Amino acid sequence: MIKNEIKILSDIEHIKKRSGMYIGSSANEMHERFLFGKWESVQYVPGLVKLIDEIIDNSVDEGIRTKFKFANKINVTIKNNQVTVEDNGRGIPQAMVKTPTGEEIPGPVAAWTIPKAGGNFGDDKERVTGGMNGVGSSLTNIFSVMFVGETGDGQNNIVVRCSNGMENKSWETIPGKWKGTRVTFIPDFMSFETNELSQVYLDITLDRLQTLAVVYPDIQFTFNGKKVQGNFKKYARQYDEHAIVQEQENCSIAVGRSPDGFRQLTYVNNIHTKNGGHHIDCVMDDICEDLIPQIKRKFKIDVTKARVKECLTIVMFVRDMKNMRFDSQTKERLTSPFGEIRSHIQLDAKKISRAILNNEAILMPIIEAALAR
Template sequence: MTTTTAGGGAGTEGGANVSGWTRARRVERANARGDVRARAVSSSAASAGRESGEYDAGSIQVLQGLEPVRKRPGMYIGSTSTKGLHHLVWEVLDNSVDEVQAGHASHVQVTVDDDGFVTVMDDGRGIPTDVHPVTGKSSLETVLTILHAGGKFGGDSSGYHVSGGLHGVGISVVNALSELVEVTVWRNGNEYTQSFSRGIATGNMKEKQQDGSGNKKGTMVRFKPDDQIFDKVKFDNNIIRTRMKELAFLNKGTELHLKTFNTKTKSYVEEKLVYAEGLKDYVLDLTADATRLHEPITFSGEMEGIRVEGSLCWTADSYSDTLLGYANSIRTIDGGTHIDGLKYSLTKTINNASRKAKLLKDADSNLGGDHVREGLSGVIAVWVPEPEFEGQTKTRLGNSEVRRIVENIASDAVMGHFEFNSADLKAVFAKAQSAFKAAEAAKRARELVRRKTVLTANRLPGKLSDCSSSDADRTEIFLVEGDSAGGSCKQGRDRSFQAVLPLRGKIMNVERKLDAAALYKNTEITNMISALGLGTMGEDLDTSALRYSKIIILTDADVDGAHIRTLLLTFLYRYQRDLFEKGFVYAAVPPLYKVAVGKKETYCYDDDDLQRVLAALPEGANKHIQRFKGLGEMMPEQLWSTTLDPKTRLLKRLTVDDASAANHMFSTLMSKEVDPRRRLIEEEGAALASIDF
């Protein structure tokens, strides 16, 4: 699970100087961005001296080159936070993987330095370097400095039958949003180099003859993101490793190397990621902590130029499904026609196979799709010559023909497997039938609860202090530990858009047994389901039914608070994983300390923060340090200025980049098995003990 910073960092409110992410840093960054945007404005418009409000030809801005990218980076990479920062790596990495998929490369290496630079190198054909007939510049400079200039528009004639990067903006966007980009190309026995800064070439392309045999080929892109654009230029090695692991699964047999710098040993650590079985290895990884009902069902095929690969495995001890979709090696987190086709195929095929095997009688109704998929872990990947993605960030596949093709290929493979493996069919059918019975029991439990007026749409939980706004896009809810903290939060919040739901004690651990009937009998669980608008367990997330755009977990900064936060995260992840996929879940970060010197108050969010503040105080200063034992100790005004105010607070958005890692972590932390949890504690304890603080 990945955390990314959202909202404000920390700053001043009501005279309190809050340390951490200081307001000064935000102002500095905002000013820098303002300078960037100011450069995009026509100088003639700036000097025209028009009166405010006058609108004529001089008011029309014409952005040149890559200026649109620097002015509106979110349009091209989604955000300027951690997610957008790593998106730059994906743009370069996907270009190298496209060379692999086209059959021109077999090795890709990513190097992450501790100075903010990332290097991506492959052994493909190398970016063309000859003079482009339209721009009059080298093709290398053309693709780096001009939007929608690339080699992937020409289909098979370009050498790319399928590709993840089809818009021709990837590498140029990286160039526009980087402080420095250095490109090296090896081809035709020569070595070509050129440097760029913030979208502009800093010199002409240089050419020299290769050393040695002269047979080296490929491209190396080394870049450092611009701190005028991004909140923080700090790459997360785990996020990069996860993406490279995905690509290694999707491109079986391809070697991907990750080199990261270890600041403790002052040396590089290199990892080789290669999977001979491809998607089968992926599913085995997803189900590593589960009891598999059968060996993974793996299939592949091609129709109408569209290639399909997939792997599926049902498990006995999981009560939800994990279906991951990819299009041209790009993760489609919002699904699409390939996922729809697989779901429809599985529902139809399992029912047909069950009737053929006499497991379903003539009088029995068909099993529903949710019941068929319970306990399923699967990966479906398609390679489409002309994919229709939603936006540059490619979160959903829209090609209608893909659904039909996936249906046909998956149905034939799954039906064929069950015809020759009747024991597997019986195990999967028993799992689906059990899910159906559990759903019926849960339905009865829900009806009982509804009669008690807890889950009805017009009767929200009594403890919920709702906000006055009904606009879900701007509202947020705090899930707060205990009535005491809930009272402070209710008094300190902005009632127009902030709701508060206090929770009593520690909620049930759903990882031990995710029993839908038991969930609907639990008061704290049903309060959250109705307050948040989560719907029925097993259904796809209906974002239009959600009552808030931010679900913020607010617990004490102690061991009990961490445990309660983990219990809440486990429930939300197992009940509706799409909340994380779509970025609705956050964790609030309350301060641990208050340092008062006279009338000046400074809030510190961890021990390191406290030491920095104390070190900056004048010698002999009369200071008072308060350690907050819980949120209930904070006055409403303090809670507002440090934790609730969007202008000053620090929020962490919780997302899932690696489904298998998330499944493994929840299983390790919260399941009945004690040994894996003990090993994790021992390993983490040993790692902390080895750090020189």
């Protein structure tokens, strides 16, 4: 008989025992991510990419919450299964904060050593950064053999050092004049199903850095000491040379061709909702409510919404969004209410619909495939 004994778990212990809920999958798997604009087959562990992207997203959040004035040179380096992110933001405040137990724990150490502790817990309606869960940076270390974070406020330098899988930790304060953040850690391969950060992880990281540079032209991302140039037109042409691009103040969409199924790549603020959500669905619905009547008047053939939808590879970017509620800790599916997404996103469906109706490189393959079948 199975021993049903009700146990009690601590936060660190629960996270280590139940990492699947907090970093997504933890075993190497196959996917079809858009690597550098190519729908190629990729094999990787979502946990490691998620942990790296946690710190990268923290740097991007520091950039965006300061209106890109501070934290605009995010030097991300990944060499020999070691991650090392640098940014020139305001950094962790040195102001004292109080734990529920009453113990006095400073800012950086509380942020980088305990979960459910972050600066994104304020008013949600005005939250613009990509962080909401207050867990995670916590996570690398929490999933790391060594994790040293060096913050500087221009007057003090705070070094938070953790080792033995976050079990050992210590924070120290030194006089200094640095202003920024330098988070460098080494992953723990005992948890994940891997032993080394191969070239594929660096390629995925470079792809997200390129996408973030395209999304945010102000921030100058750097990878392994090499600058990253952010231009949307080249990024969209990397998908298909005949892509149709429409930019707005908060929406930035591009339409390509999907010959072997359905494809997409969407970003909300600085979060890669790679499992879609409601924004892509709402945008595509609005586009189709204009295509279907127009294609009816033009080619006089009845086509369903899904038939047209399955032949487009939409790459779409959203900026300055608020209330980005997700459904997974990995934040892979934007589940914000459709009304809020429609209110914030001001994309003109008629413009893109007319643009792709006027082009023979996209509509004609759809028409030919429908007529042949």
